[PDB]
Scaffold this active site. Structure first.
Site, PDB file in Angstrom:
ATOM      1  N   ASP A   1      21.494  11.526  11.869  1.00  0.00           N
ATOM      2  CA  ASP A   1      20.389  10.560  11.649  1.00  0.00           C
ATOM      3  C   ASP A   1      21.024   9.171  11.509  1.00  0.00           C
ATOM      4  OD1 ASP A   1      18.352   8.882  10.846  1.00  0.00           O
ATOM      5  OD2 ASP A   1      17.394  10.417   9.561  1.00  0.00           O
TER       6      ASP A   1
ATOM      7  N   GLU B   1      21.195  10.756  -2.083  1.00  0.00           N
ATOM      8  CA  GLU B   1      20.184  10.857  -1.012  1.00  0.00           C
ATOM      9  C   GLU B   1      19.269  11.995  -1.418  1.00  0.00           C
ATOM     10  OE1 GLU B   1      19.518  12.423   2.974  1.00  0.00           O
ATOM     11  OE2 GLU B   1      18.024  12.006   1.396  1.00  0.00           O
TER      12      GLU B   1
ATOM     13  N   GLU C   1      11.384  18.848  -2.120  1.00  0.00           N
ATOM     14  CA  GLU C   1      12.708  19.394  -2.555  1.00  0.00           C
ATOM     15  C   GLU C   1      13.024  19.085  -4.037  1.00  0.00           C
ATOM     16  OE1 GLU C   1      14.697  18.443   1.712  1.00  0.00           O
ATOM     17  OE2 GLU C   1      16.139  18.969   0.126  1.00  0.00           O
TER      18      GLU C   1
ATOM     19  N   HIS D   1      14.896  11.547  10.629  1.00  0.00           N
ATOM     20  CA  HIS D   1      14.667  12.999  10.569  1.00  0.00           C
ATOM     21  C   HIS D   1      13.637  13.313   9.470  1.00  0.00           C
ATOM     22  CE1 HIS D   1      18.720  14.001  12.840  1.00  0.00           C
ATOM     23  NE2 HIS D   1      17.914  13.141  13.516  1.00  0.00           N
TER      24      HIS D   1
HETATM   25  N1  LIG Z   1      17.660  14.220   3.640  1.00  0.00           N
HETATM   26  C1  LIG Z   1      17.090  15.380   3.583  1.00  0.00           C
HETATM   27  N2  LIG Z   1      17.003  15.963   2.395  1.00  0.00           N
HETATM   28  C2  LIG Z   1      17.442  15.277   1.179  1.00  0.00           C
HETATM   29  C3  LIG Z   1      18.324  16.117   0.282  1.00  0.00           C
HETATM   30  C4  LIG Z   1      19.701  16.430   0.845  1.00  0.00           C
HETATM   31  N3  LIG Z   1      20.706  16.452  -0.220  1.00  0.00           N
HETATM   32  C5  LIG Z   1      21.810  15.492  -0.075  1.00  0.00           C
HETATM   33  C6  LIG Z   1      22.881  15.844   0.944  1.00  0.00           C
HETATM   34  N4  LIG Z   1      23.920  14.829   0.840  1.00  0.00           N
HETATM   35  C7  LIG Z   1      24.474  14.205   1.892  1.00  0.00           C
HETATM   36  O1  LIG Z   1      24.252  14.546   3.068  1.00  0.00           O
HETATM   37  N5  LIG Z   1      25.336  13.218   1.556  1.00  0.00           N
HETATM   38  C8  LIG Z   1      26.054  12.432   2.553  1.00  0.00           C
HETATM   39  C9  LIG Z   1      25.231  11.375   3.248  1.00  0.00           C
HETATM   40  C10 LIG Z   1      24.116  10.809   2.629  1.00  0.00           C
HETATM   41  C11 LIG Z   1      23.427   9.767   3.232  1.00  0.00           C
HETATM   42  C12 LIG Z   1      23.847   9.266   4.460  1.00  0.00           C
HETATM   43  C13 LIG Z   1      24.945   9.823   5.084  1.00  0.00           C
HETATM   44  C14 LIG Z   1      25.619  10.886   4.496  1.00  0.00           C
HETATM   45  C15 LIG Z   1      20.978  17.789  -0.752  1.00  0.00           C
HETATM   46  C16 LIG Z   1      22.304  17.970  -1.460  1.00  0.00           C
HETATM   47  O2  LIG Z   1      22.120  18.023  -2.902  1.00  0.00           O
HETATM   48  C17 LIG Z   1      22.714  19.219  -3.373  1.00  0.00           C
HETATM   49  N6  LIG Z   1      22.120  19.565  -4.663  1.00  0.00           N
HETATM   50  C18 LIG Z   1      20.826  19.952  -4.903  1.00  0.00           C
HETATM   51  N7  LIG Z   1      20.535  20.097  -6.174  1.00  0.00           N
HETATM   52  C19 LIG Z   1      21.719  19.774  -6.821  1.00  0.00           C
HETATM   53  C20 LIG Z   1      22.054  19.669  -8.185  1.00  0.00           C
HETATM   54  N8  LIG Z   1      21.238  20.038  -9.182  1.00  0.00           N
HETATM   55  N9  LIG Z   1      23.297  19.222  -8.495  1.00  0.00           N
HETATM   56  C21 LIG Z   1      24.142  18.941  -7.499  1.00  0.00           C
HETATM   57  N10 LIG Z   1      23.941  19.024  -6.178  1.00  0.00           N
HETATM   58  C22 LIG Z   1      22.707  19.446  -5.903  1.00  0.00           C
HETATM   59  C23 LIG Z   1      22.492  20.224  -2.246  1.00  0.00           C
HETATM   60  O3  LIG Z   1      23.351  21.346  -2.352  1.00  0.00           O
HETATM   61  C24 LIG Z   1      22.826  19.345  -1.031  1.00  0.00           C
HETATM   62  O4  LIG Z   1      24.209  19.195  -0.735  1.00  0.00           O
HETATM   63  N11 LIG Z   1      16.637  16.045   4.696  1.00  0.00           N
HETATM   64  C25 LIG Z   1      16.695  15.559   6.085  1.00  0.00           C
HETATM   65  C26 LIG Z   1      15.548  14.638   6.417  1.00  0.00           C
HETATM   66  C27 LIG Z   1      16.165  13.591   7.382  1.00  0.00           C
HETATM   67  C28 LIG Z   1      17.436  13.290   6.901  1.00  0.00           C
HETATM   68  C29 LIG Z   1      17.987  14.677   6.447  1.00  0.00           C
END
Ligand SMILES: N=C(NCCCN(CCNC(=O)NCc1ccccc1)C[C@H]1O[C@@H](n2cnc3c(N)ncnc32)[C@H](O)[C@@H]1O)NC1CCCC1
Ligand SMILES: N=C(NCCCN(CCNC(=O)NCc1ccccc1)C[C@H]1O[C@@H](n2cnc3c(N)ncnc32)[C@H](O)[C@@H]1O)NC1CCCC1
Ligand SMILES: [Ca+2]
Ligand SMILES: [Ca+2]
Ligand SMILES: [Ca+2]
Ligand SMILES: [Ca+2]
Lengths: 331, 331
Positions: free
Chosen positions: B20, B112, B121, B269
């Protein structure tokens, strides 16, 4: 488990399954060409969903049909039973076949417990468990299951796994070097069984068969399934993995009806399944490819797949551990 | 919950998210145009996944970055930290932000946590929980979230829901009359939020905004979110439902950077989300469409969506209860 019964709770899922023409037509034909096996009998319909198999049992003259369904699809089956005027004959029992009460033993159990590769979803364990309600003269529809294995050659599929993982080669993704993860990414792609259909021309040897006889087999027989194979190679090339499909047979009085998901047969929503080796094996026509497929039931309602193969004439060997809970849907 | 951390455990999911372009580029720009806010600071990266935001923090001169990740993606982040020569500066802590120990408080939390419609979520609850580790002068990146609502007209989408359900009209599906389930099937299609993009020309009124200030807001603020709306209709036609999107703002010293998933903006996305009414409302230009969107957190890591709308001038009213855990991906 609350995720599994929610997913089967959806009328859109029941619609998608009923639109499998081979699945729906084969079950109707099995039950109705063998109608004398249902005429004035008692029937248990295990995981009945919308109740279509109970209706087929009724078309065949069954006296009483117990339709057991653990998901909220039960309350929708009840609506169709009332609306098709069959409340005296079809009884919908909401709950798991393991936890519910039937007032009488049955002449015949009907069910559609087949997952991808037959064993996926382990609703087969619920089908076998239901035999506690089966009279000793009783039949099961379906009666037997055959899993077919055969080696395949498909350099496009093999290479597609590397292409997907090559995202991770980037030495400057926004100033981050991803490359140290390329191998882990390849690994993870190769751990996914591939669900789609293929031309039989890619098979390198005649399939081997592993039979489950649902009349005789018991719940515990399916915790650990061992499938040894010796393939007589009919072609010379790289063997990239093993292809899987299954057949079930409805063995009635009048007729044995087969439901086949073989690649020579009309397509079903089970497609076929391929498991890649980490590393392909060169085999010449005349060589033997020997080894074991092992399915080990995990506490996630699925199976760890172990595959080991060796060309006897060279000792070139290859393996994979695959995860039937993370399939890749390539179709 | 074991299903949620497994799904985020996959390098294929991290790849799909990193591809994305708007998401990745906007975060890099937010963190690096505001590099003085990171220079020699302490940083908590909550749900770090592969660790890219920790790397951005490091590009900006951060002294120490704690990267917390509850999934097995943690062990992959650790591999990239070693391979990018940053073990002194980035510390990967495997576990939930709620259950782990940090040795010191932080200047800034980055994350994020945005789902579809922002709240999906409920990783937002983990972002707010992390503030226990934040110095009182500390910032959060992102800083605020705006959810946008607007009424839309789309007879094609509306009618598509009936077309899907018309499978169930068959009075003889293999001798079974399905028709008594047509209504239940319609109902179930209308309970699915629609995830895809659309032309802004379908919006009938200017959006209304609901702001969450992540600096001030607390975990409990998100169990029940109430979004009252009064729309000044700019067009005459059927209103088929409400469209949703969101903006987050990274409010630094030097610069405020916006990540927008609005339909006027480049596609992400997150797409956009539409919730249909059971029954459309006729509104003329000049009318007011008033009511409430209500999000109620359920014990399934998601939200029940209640929508009530009424044309003030006619009293024509319409509602829906939608289930953000069974989205329809129309894209
Ligand atoms: N974005 C989402 N969903 C949002 C949640 C995702 N999330 C972020 C992913 N981190 C990511 O890509 N970072 C790199 C990045 C970020 C931004 C830009 C470039 C790169 C989920 C993440 O948090 C984790 N988790 C959940 N609950 C807990 C907790 N209690 N404690 C600790 N971790 C926990 C999870 O296992 C997991 O690793 N969906 C799609 C729609 C379009 C874009 C993608
Ligand atoms: N077939 C599958 N998966 C197999 C399992 C589905 N199964 C059969 C669906 N019943 C169906 O369509 N019947 C009508 C029909 C059948 C054949 C032909 C026409 C119409 C799952 C069903 O058992 C239920 N369940 C699981 N564990 C238990 C239990 N302990 N006790 C009781 N019920 C339990 C579930 O909630 C659910 O209702 N996938 C697709 C591949 C292509 C074809 C479709
Ligand atoms: Ca009938
Ligand atoms: Ca770049
Ligand atoms: Ca860096
Ligand atoms: Ca027919």
């Amino acid at each position: 488990a609350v995720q599994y019964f929610q997913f089967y709770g959806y009328l859109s899922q029941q619609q998608n399954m009923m639109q499998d023409y081979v699945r729906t037509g084969t079950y109707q034909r099995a039950i109705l060409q063998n109608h004398t096996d249902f005429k004035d009998k008692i029937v248990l319909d295990v995981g009945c969903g919308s109740g279509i198999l109970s209706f087929f049992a009724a078309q065949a003259g069954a006296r009483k049909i117990y339709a057991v369904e653990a998901s909220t699809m039960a309350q929708h089956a009840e609506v169709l039973v009332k609306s098709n005027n069959l409340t005296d004959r079809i009884v919908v029992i909401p709950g798991k076949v393991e936890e519910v009460s039937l007032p009488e033993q049955v002449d015949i159990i009907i069910s559609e417990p087949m997952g991808y590769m037959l064993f996926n979803e382990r609703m087969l364990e619920s089908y076998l468990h239901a035999k506690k309600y089966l009279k000793p003269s009783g039949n099961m529809f379906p009666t037997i299951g055959d899993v077919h294995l055969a080696p395949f050659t498909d350099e496009q599929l093999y290479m597609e796994q590397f292409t997907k993982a090559n995202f991770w080669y980037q030495p400057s993704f926004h100033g981050v070097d991803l490359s140290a993860l390329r191998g882990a990414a390849v690994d993870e792609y190769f751990r996914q069984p591939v669900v789609d259909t293929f031309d039989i021309r890619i098979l390198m040897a005649k399939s081997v068969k592993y039979t489950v006889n649902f009349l005789e087999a018991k719940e515990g027989d399916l915790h650990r399934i061992e499938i040894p194979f010796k393939f007589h190679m009919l072609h010379s090339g790289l063997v990239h993995g093993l292809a899987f499909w299954f057949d079930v047979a409805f063995i009635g009085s009048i007729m044995t009806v087969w439901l086949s998901t073989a690649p020579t047969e009309p397509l079903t929503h089970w497609y076929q399944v391929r498991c890649l080796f980490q590393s392909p094996l060169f085999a010449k026509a005349g060589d033997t490819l020997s080894g074991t497929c092992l399915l080990i039931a995990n506490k996630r309602q699925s199976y760890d797949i172990s595959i080991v193969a060796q060309v006897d004439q060279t000792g070139s060997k290859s393996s994979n551990l695959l995860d039937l809970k993370n399939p890749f849907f390539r179709y």
